[PDB]
Amino acid sequence: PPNNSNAAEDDLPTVELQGVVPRGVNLQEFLNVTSVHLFKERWDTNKVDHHTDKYENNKLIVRRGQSFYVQIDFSRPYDPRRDLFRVEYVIGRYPQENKGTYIPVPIVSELQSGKWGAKIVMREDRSVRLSIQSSPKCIVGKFRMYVAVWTPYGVLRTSRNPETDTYILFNPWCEDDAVYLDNEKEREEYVLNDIGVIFYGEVNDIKTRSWSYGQFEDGILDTCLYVMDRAQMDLSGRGNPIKVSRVGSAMVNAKDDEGVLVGSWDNIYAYGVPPSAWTGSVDILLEYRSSENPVRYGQCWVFAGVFNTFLRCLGIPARIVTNYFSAHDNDANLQMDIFVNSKLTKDSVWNYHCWNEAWMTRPDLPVGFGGWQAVDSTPQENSDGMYRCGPASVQAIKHGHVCFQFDAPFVFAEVNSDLIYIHVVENVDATHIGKLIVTKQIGGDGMMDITDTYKFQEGQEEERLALETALMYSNVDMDFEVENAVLGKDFKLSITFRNNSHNRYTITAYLSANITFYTGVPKAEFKKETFDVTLEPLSFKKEAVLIQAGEYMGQLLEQASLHFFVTARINETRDVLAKQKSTVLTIPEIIIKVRGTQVVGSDMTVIVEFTNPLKETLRNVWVHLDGPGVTRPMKKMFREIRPNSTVQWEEVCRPRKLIASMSSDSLRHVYGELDVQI
């Protein structure tokens, strides 16, 4: 049967005898658990290191992909030569290992990266202390803990004990988690902050409503798990933030799924609470858990207020945005069809709208479409048969790549749809929709303008080109390849146009070059250029834009890649050709060796070898050695290095880490390192 309930439990036997165990067998020969300690208190290392001390909850709450300490007390001291046991974390009524819901945790000697395991770190008396490491992709929820001792007759498991139950949450602190956020300030605001502000009003008259998210208050966490139970969300997917965010975007509104909040706009709000009355999320969600029925009522800002609590409570970093002059598209044409005329016209435009943004990687999308994802629980339009919206990649909306799931065309139309006064046309307005998008700033109640994340500035040619690309989701081919990109050196970006027609064309285009992480999260735009090229008939044209090294070297990170947007419009036919590609920089590295005894009080030779990576001629090569405690900083110059030729630098020194760096005239800031013990 489907296993989609954290509340439901199966019963795990305490004496899993196998075969025909003879009568009179003596199970006292084997270990049994007298006590288990989880150090669950909110001052101890577990909750503090896992950023869960805030939760008003007396049970162990950890975040996945991180180590926490437990202690198991046995009847006699644990002996590895004769004892074999494992820890188990179980969830649901139908737990299987291959479904992620039965998790065996073997007692190992060394914790492995991204694998479940427990390592002993203390053995005093009859007690062993364990550092347990969870998988950075583990299901999020309330697990049941067991200690299982293996015997030749079966497994001796502990009895059910709800005091050892453990919540495992999303970990925005673990670089192996899809919700990883490499910024403590951003983490404290988008995860640990339980209050905030929401903006509303008009574009020129802006009001501020404060909201108490209260994700750490008693009952809220269990409620969020209940919200997922009520959705019948299969447990095997509750570790995927894309599924958790999309299920939330449906379950917060009461339509078609008996969700948390009922939307009403009719100025009456009979037999319920007016939307303007709510000041936080705790009372809505708790009433949902108590009554087990939807709460009345809510509107745009209240849906986001509760959705924000749901996301932060589970661990997904989340913020609330406000779109002023948000458009409502009814016929999915990405236009505001205006006929005035109230009978034929069905497209509306709100003074403002509020939806949520959730921080996650998008492994289901190409590289570059991670980071902030737009999610809207407010019921506006159907999506695949339900009232939900997102996660839509804000990055995909900016360049009009609305073909990437989910519901990107809708969110694009909300922020940058043109007005079409329509058989016959008349006027076309292109600046009215999405005048301003805002969100609460870090460290204050100010207003961070984030309009530039969803769309290019109205007026600029990239805005139109992005829009016309979105509307698209004359015998001309278009492609671009990156010309031998080496870290620390200028490289060429060659846009190619092939015209197979007998006509002469004019092409307007823009180029967007971006640094993205290895996971696929965007960092920044380091180059943006618009350009115009003419295409003679039966020709090929290779316009090559030069990316200078100084343009991107300032914002690079470990294993970062380059994401390029190139959208070109055929002016004569108004066609739009759009490509997006990712490339990893060919990064040179410095090999550092140490020969000799590496003790203090004696000389040792540090050998630095560098290989010329370019087909060019390197001149004025400066190599710098740095290593505090080993050798004072020094520099070896090299007036010339021939192509594909290797250089070696020896440096004696009497003494920790060593860092080397090369910089020439055509290649700068290429590094190497080596950890040395002394």
């Binding site: 509303y200 800002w301 002059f325 016209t345 509306s348 435009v349 709100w350 003074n351 007005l419």
Partner: peptide
């Protein structure tokens, strides 16, 4: 959240 005249 008001609907706004076109």
């Amino acid at each position: 959240x008001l609907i706004l005249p076109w």
